[PDB]
């Protein structure tokens, strides 16, 4: 019975190893079925997204400063409270387009 | 070493015995199928690569071919035959023959694994509890074939191998990782690592479902909210109190 | 003879196509909806983001 739990204790190590690497890389591929998903469906075929997502390639390719990119980010916050037709949105796409 | 003609395959990559359904859209290789069951009833199954062309060049297929054994050849009316396959085991491309079938020569893969009750065990373990819970997310398979083809039917780990491998929806190329390898122990570990991508798929896609369904009923119940009061406002006026 | 509503029952089956054009309307405004089901746990609609 001491050979049994030493055994038991050992499966018990492995398919928490195994239960570890199914979660270490689920919580990230959460991520990229994320950032596929809202590539794909917002325009569905269109893909309104990727207008809006090539200056996200251009925030994590050349927009690197935090105190630089804090103003961007909440600017992208900005950028999906209104239309992007409206008079005022010009400026706003301008913003980031010239700090981009 | 096994002089038998070839049936290649477009997109199914048939595994050593797995039990699986192959439809023929060509006539020299609708005649190397019969051939091949006039002649003691033994197919090799190779599939071709990346765009496939439609007649498969000797050299356009991959490195291990897998050797088969007809079931029966039925023809279908409109043309196409459907051939019914099983397989016996994989064999090792040297070179084949342009003349309009496809000619094996030839090898075999007589390699079984070493550290078999030590390290092998524990790795057919993980095997078992990957493919375990693989349809408890998968959903689109059998349970009971999946615990019948299990180590407590079938004992064989290259059988066992090919079998986990062949019940994913993978590409033309990472069933022929599978197919190709002579050490068994190094699939195992590449085919746990598929299961968990495919189980890192399909738990993701039940939280996407289990995601979605909250935030429909706040959707259906906020729509309910504001068409209906929006217009619990009209009847305080009574007339809007002279049209506004 | 035709006019005393022959046409009407291929009008409702005009109507047949309106209701199939109503589904994938509905189902456009559906799948439009649920990609933000999917955003509202990405983020999207927690205390710290917009």
Do not use: C
């Not at chain 1, 990727?50 to 994590?60: A, D, G, K, S, V």
């Not at chain 1, 804090?70 to 400026?91: D, I, Y």
């Not at chain 2, 491309?93 to 094996?104: M, Q, T």
Request: proline share 5%.
């Amino acid at each position: 019975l001491l050979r049994d739990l030493e055994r038991f204790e050992l499966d018990k190590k492995i398919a928490a190893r195994v239960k570890e690497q199914m979660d270490q890389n689920q919580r990230e591929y959460y991520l990229r079925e994320q950032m596929k998903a809202i590539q794909k469906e917002l325009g569905g075929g269109e893909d309104f997204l990727t207008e809006i997502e090539e200056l996200r390639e251009r925030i994590e390719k050349k927009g690197m400063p935090e105190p630089v990119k804090e103003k961007a980010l909440k600017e992208l916050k900005r950028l999906e409270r209104m239309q992007p037709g409206s008079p005022e949105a010009t400026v706003s796409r301008t913003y980031l387009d010239w700090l981009l | 070493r096994l002089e038998l003609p070839v049936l290649p395959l477009r997109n199914t990559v048939v595994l050593p015995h797995t039990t699986t359904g192959v439809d023929v859209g060509r006539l020299k290789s609708k005649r190397a199928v019969e051939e091949a069951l006039s002649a003691d009833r033994l197919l090799f199954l190779v599939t071709q690569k990346d765009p496939e062309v439609d007649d498969p060049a000797p050299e356009d297929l991959y490195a291990v071919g897998t050797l088969a054994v007809v079931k029966q050849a039925m023809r279908l009316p409109d043309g196409t035959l459907q051939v019914m396959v099983e397989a016996r085991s994989r064999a090792r491309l040297l070179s084949y023959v342009a003349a309009p079938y496809l000619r094996a020569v030839g090898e075999a893969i007589p390699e079984p694994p070493l550290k078999d009750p030590e390290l092998a065990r524990v790795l057919v373990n993980e095997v078992q509890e990957a493919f375990e819970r693989y349809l408890q997310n998968h959903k689109t398979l059998r349970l009971d074939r999946y615990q019948q083809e299990a180590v407590k039917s079938t004992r064989d780990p290259a059988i066992l191998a090919d079998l986990v491998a062949h019940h994913a929806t993978w590409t033309l190329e990472e069933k022929q990782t599978i197919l190709e390898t002579p050490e068994v122990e190094e699939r195992l570990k590449r085919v746990l690592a598929l299961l968990l991508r495919d189980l890192e798929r399909f738990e993701l896609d039940k939280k996407i479902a289990a995601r979605v369904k909250e935030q429909m009923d706040q959707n259906q119940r906020e729509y309910y909210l504001r068409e209906q009061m929006k217009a619990i406002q009209k009847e305080l006026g009574g007339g809007e109190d002279f049209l506004t």
